[PDB]
Design an enzyme around this catalytic site. Sequence first.
Site, PDB file in Angstrom:
ATOM      1  N   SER A  31       3.684   1.618   1.574  1.00  0.00           N
ATOM      2  CA  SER A  31       3.981   2.488   2.825  1.00  0.00           C
ATOM      3  C   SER A  31       3.000   2.385   3.961  1.00  0.00           C
ATOM      4  O   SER A  31       1.732   2.231   3.381  1.00  0.00           O
ATOM      5  CB  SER A  31       4.291   3.992   2.321  1.00  0.00           C
ATOM      6  OG  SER A  31       5.271   3.976   1.528  1.00  0.00           O
TER       7      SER A  31
HETATM    8  N1  LIG Z   1       7.425   5.719  -0.014  1.00  0.00           N
HETATM    9  C1  LIG Z   1       6.003   6.456  -0.368  1.00  0.00           C
HETATM   10  C2  LIG Z   1       5.119   6.996   0.718  1.00  0.00           C
HETATM   11  C3  LIG Z   1       4.032   5.839   0.220  1.00  0.00           C
HETATM   12  C4  LIG Z   1       5.046   4.668   0.104  1.00  0.00           C
HETATM   13  O1  LIG Z   1       6.147   4.823  -0.809  1.00  0.00           O
HETATM   14  O2  LIG Z   1       3.906   3.889  -0.438  1.00  0.00           O
HETATM   15  C5  LIG Z   1       6.294   7.836  -0.933  1.00  0.00           C
HETATM   16  O3  LIG Z   1       7.367   8.376  -0.366  1.00  0.00           O
HETATM   17  O4  LIG Z   1       5.831   8.309  -1.954  1.00  0.00           O
END
Ligand SMILES: N[C@@H](CCC(O)O)C(=O)O
EC number: 3.5.1.11
Lengths: 216, 535
Positions: free
Chosen positions: B1
């Site tokens: 992310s």
């Molecule tokens: N998608 C993540 C945010 C961090 C990413 O996935 O690494 C999440 O919503 O946990």
Amino acid sequence: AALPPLSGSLPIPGLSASVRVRRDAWGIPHIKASGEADAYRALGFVHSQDRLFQMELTRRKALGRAAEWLGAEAAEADILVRRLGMEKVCRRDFEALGVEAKDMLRAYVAGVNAFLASGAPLPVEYGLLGAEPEPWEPWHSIAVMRRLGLLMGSVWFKLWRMLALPVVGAANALKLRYDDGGRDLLCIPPGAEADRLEADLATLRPAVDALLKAMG
Amino acid sequence: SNNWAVAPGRTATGRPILAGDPHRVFEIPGFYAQHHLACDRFDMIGLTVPGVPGFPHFAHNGKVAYCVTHAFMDIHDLYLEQFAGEGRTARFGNDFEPVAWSRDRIAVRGGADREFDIVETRHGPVIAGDPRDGAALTLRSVQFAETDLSFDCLTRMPGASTVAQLYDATRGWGLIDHNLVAGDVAGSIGHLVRARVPSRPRENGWLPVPGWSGEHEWRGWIPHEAMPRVIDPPGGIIVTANNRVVADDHPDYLCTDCHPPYRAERIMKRLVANPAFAVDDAAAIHADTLSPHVGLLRRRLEALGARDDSAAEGLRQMLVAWDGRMDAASEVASAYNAFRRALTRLVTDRSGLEQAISHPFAAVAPGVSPQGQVWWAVPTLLRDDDAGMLKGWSWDQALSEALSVASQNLTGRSWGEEHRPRFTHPLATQFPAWAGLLNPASRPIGGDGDTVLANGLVPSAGPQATYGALSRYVFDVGNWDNSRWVVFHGASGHPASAHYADQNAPWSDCAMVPMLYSWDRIAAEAVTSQELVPA
Ligand SMILES: N[C@@H](CCC(O)O)C(=O)O
């Protein structure tokens, strides 16, 4: 006509006042309520108009019932979440919650249940599967939320290093992790850098020996 | 992310700017959906999780904006249990104690029901191995172990007016660990580690640990006020990108595993070079495709010297000359990827790690991928020239073999077409004649798992993107109608809908669409309007 009606007016049992839902040029819903309970009720409803199949599929995965839709490929994932106790910990969580959170969850699923009772045609997936949607209980949202982040992070790496132990040895297995580019950029303090600690085989020895024995 | 915040003294606007993008597998419909929800208590816009009320991760409420990346705190421990009594008792200290056993059953479409045992010790459920054989693994996870009040945070967060209030409001959040990065109209920026993490030894982070000795038990919770946080740091820049949050000499053990720092570094570098960051600059950092490995790849292949095989030597010259960009237009980027896949495959076979998942202890669904793991460690071992797992080969032999293999696998496609995701509806394999309707349309895209544009893949499976930004956003804090967002397919989950797949076009370009907050613009632009009325 494979699609739910997104104009006019639609009744929701339990609303105190009207809620207006405007979908923009990209179909994104902008929902305007008076009270907070109406807001959550409308959000349950609008979620379901666009995403009913997702929601119920995600819930089924949370509750170990996805193989009922997906067949054998989901069987082992269903078994795991059953063993983890999804329903037990989501009910437990719900009982401990303060009254505002309980009310938000109750309003939310009364909106979901209202959609199910609205007489919309069912999404194409329900047609394919020959399926009918099942009604929602407040604690179901906790299970869906838990499913979203299920087992993310460290467990995989520990399981992986353990599996590598008898294959490559301890010294090597303990190097099996994501690269650090030579040295991490840290988040806190911003801009700071530092060398991560490598594994201390001497302190890990009894864990390693125990696992070798257990696995062999 | 990815996410970042830029302070007022470094933005084009003199107000905070927050931007980023969560990375997940491209499951259909996307895990996050765009919503705007207003009532008398709050007026909020961001990403929701269909089936869950509120805005757990990404939103603003007209005063504070917030967004997250997965922190890679260590929130799950595996315990090696010693059992006796044919599985009915497990050791704790010097006593064997009754274990909970019960039976359960799932139905399976097109097959017979499966009955199974649920075994549970004082650490938690057995997830691998057979307790009847004397040892098995149990999981104790912050996600399951004790009452969790995260859902109480959902009703408090909407009311926050400052960064600090937001962070109070999240007290008790434990379902998942996030770098919660926030900005407010008063001008602050922050990063909090929003997580519940048990207090316990660094050792638990490396391997399943002995459940009986007491050496490895949880000693309570790291307090809320002890969790790492920073507010208004002096460089005016916050970046997080799943990279190690604090140094390992931090006094609480928080992390062994996280992503490499490539993404954070590249984000940080571009923000540092621009002390007048504008809203429009977010999209260029989203789209960043420079691979962190070009240098290492070049040096090593350089030093390797001309090959005898002709296809292989061609692949080598091409890789040695590559500018290291995973651009959608770049054919050489596909060849780098093919080479790295072949390299990773060879190292995994050679070391025997490919068969590590034969063991019954590996049976935790969906399972670990030996290639998918080794892929990330190869750069370290290559950079340190550590041939310890190659059974007599040197890295130069692995590299050369990989050139040979990879040269037979060159499609010549631009990386965009080579990497284009095949977005697969969950029912597409069961209804293959419907795959054309069910699978949202996808366009060519670049990036890989190392680049800020993090369209990663499954190395054992092929080059096709399998995970990446489910959404991108930038918040113009205090000029809210200038905020922007996108999702990778669209708002609708109905394959027939005009909005099932229409956002894929701007998303594939790394462009975004207005995140509309003023009701008067929303009224002016509504395509459909619906009243939801009391009974
Ligand atoms: N998608 C993540 C945010 C961090 C990413 O996935 O690494 C999440 O919503 O946990």
